[PDB]
């Protein structure tokens, strides 16, 4: 037993990740098949990132211009091309490493884990949601740009992530693998808003079920509610609506505990309406909102890869 | 910037887990060169565990009594030895995929990133810390036994755990790579008393370094201490007495800061005396005490592998 943030295996990733350089500006790229991705503001300097025209910009550069190396091997470019916030780099070697894959874009809500890297070279591992106002909460220092997110299935690697760009607040924002952004966001160095965030209703649900399983099981009360009275408490603690569908995603771990979900739902109630009295659950003094439905069955049933 | 409980990539390790299979009982082995490493208790049955003579239930077994499987490739025993509370198993194929690799045994209040396997399978990747009473909080779940821990610098692997139990409070227990147990457990079905566990003084404070690198501040104070006053606040919390080894550890996230180590003891004494009034510090309601100094250092400076 036991229930702790988990990360997928990130082997099959490590084997794709390259080093690209354009100029002066150095980033992380994604080798799949004979395709190198990555951010396309690797064309831009320091002063370019304030309001780049990017068309112009990738006009001035030809396929000598892109260095890509994986480790120490070079790959040579012989096309590029630009897709919405992504450039791809055609090269002339098919990655021997290139596992089973798919580019997917994700649902505000759902988790995934990021491969942190520093000038094509990882260095860790870590696991987070897409927030409802889709940004995430991650780490990323000064060259991890080009850092991607994926979830797998048995032996098939979702990428669903590239790392682009820190917003002035601090939270992280980028585009899914057609290089479309997440969010309303933009590959530019300007103000942007992310708007509100709200907490993950479901998420939470799904955790209070893993504590129950796992023991914890003091926040278990004497109520029920009604889906419309539990939706007006969420929305005065700013809580996404709670829908049939998401009750219906529960289903499993209601039926594994033999707690129905309405009771589950009138139990975050009361600890959203009195909070915790310094009592912990699962080694948290905070309602945890970044597991969902799925992970919680992976990790209480040791589902593999 | 941000933070985040970061583990190191995984893929060096994944190339070295194989599945072992005595009889009924099968879990994970470390694959390192021609010897695969795994706990003695793969030898044992379900009634086995109340009490088992090691000696007499290994002397039954022959080389061909044990399978080994590598993914698919199939491995041969030729040789079997008992280390402590380890067996190995001597293949006559080399690992192709062996990394360079050290065998450690760690001090209580280090981390290191734990691969979750079944069947030979990884499922998972979390850091973690060996407490002061030698136990992990862990997320293991039946057959996960034979699981590794690990650190990485640049390219060697540093094998520093081998999970063998969970104790009947659903704590872990397990050895170094010599088969030798971190703290007083024994490879039995018994009740086993942990002792009083502590917090991790050290790295409560290498984590207040990091929350005020990232821009959480509420917490710096107006007072300092000394390290005799200190140590009277934490002795009545529970937590390790600082020594000056610690505060040298500390010295370059304070030079980095400007914030001498004593006065971040007068704000964690404070936050000790008063908690957080509902207040957060990296997005955690409760003092964290996972991150080690280097571990610190290591994620706001991008350290790469």
């Known amino acids: 037993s036991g229930f702790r943030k988990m990360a997928f295996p990130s082997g099959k990733v490590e084997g794709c990740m390259v080093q ?8 992380n790229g994604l080798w799949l098949d004979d395709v190198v991705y990555c ?6 300097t320091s002063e370019d990132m304030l309001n780049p025209n990017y068309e112009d910009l990738l006009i001035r550069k030809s396929n000598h211009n892109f260095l890509v190396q994986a480790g120490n091997v070079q790959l040579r470019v012989i096309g590029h091309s630009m897709q ?26 759902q988790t995934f884990s990021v491969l ?6 990882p260095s860790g591992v870590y696991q987070c949601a897409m927030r409802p106002n889709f940004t995430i909460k991650g780490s990323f220092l000064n060259g991890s740009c080009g850092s991607v997110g994926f979830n797998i299935d048995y032996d098939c690697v979702s990428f669903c992530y590239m790392h682009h760009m820190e917003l002035p607040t601090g939270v992280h924002a980028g585009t899914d693998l057609e290089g479309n952004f997440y969010g309303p966001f933009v590959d530019r160095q300007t103000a942007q808003a992310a708007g509100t965030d709200t907490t993950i209703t479901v998420n939470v649900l799904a955790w209070l079920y893993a504590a129950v399983i796992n023991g914890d099981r003091w926040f278990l009360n004497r109520f029920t509610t009604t889906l419309n009275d539990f939706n007006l408490v969420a929305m005065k603690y700013n809580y996404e609506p709670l829908t049939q569908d998401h009750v219906d995603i529960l289903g499993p771990l209601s039926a594994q505990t033999g707690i129905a979900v309405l009771d589950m739902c009138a139990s975050l109630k009361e600890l959203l309406q009195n909070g915790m009295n310094g009592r912990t659950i699962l080694g948290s003094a905070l309602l945890e909102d970044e597991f969902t439905p799925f992970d919680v069955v992976r990790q209480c049933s040791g589902v593999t890869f």
Chains 1, 2 share one sequence.
């Open 84 to 109: 919405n916030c992504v450039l791809k780099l055609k090269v002339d070697t098919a990655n021997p490493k290139t596992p089973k894959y798919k580019f997917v874009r994700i649902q505000p809500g």
């Open 20 to 27: 690209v350089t354009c100029g002066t500006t150095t980033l």
């Open 116 to 121: 942190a890297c520093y000038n094509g070279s």
């Open 39 to 44: 951010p396309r503001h690797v064309i831009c």
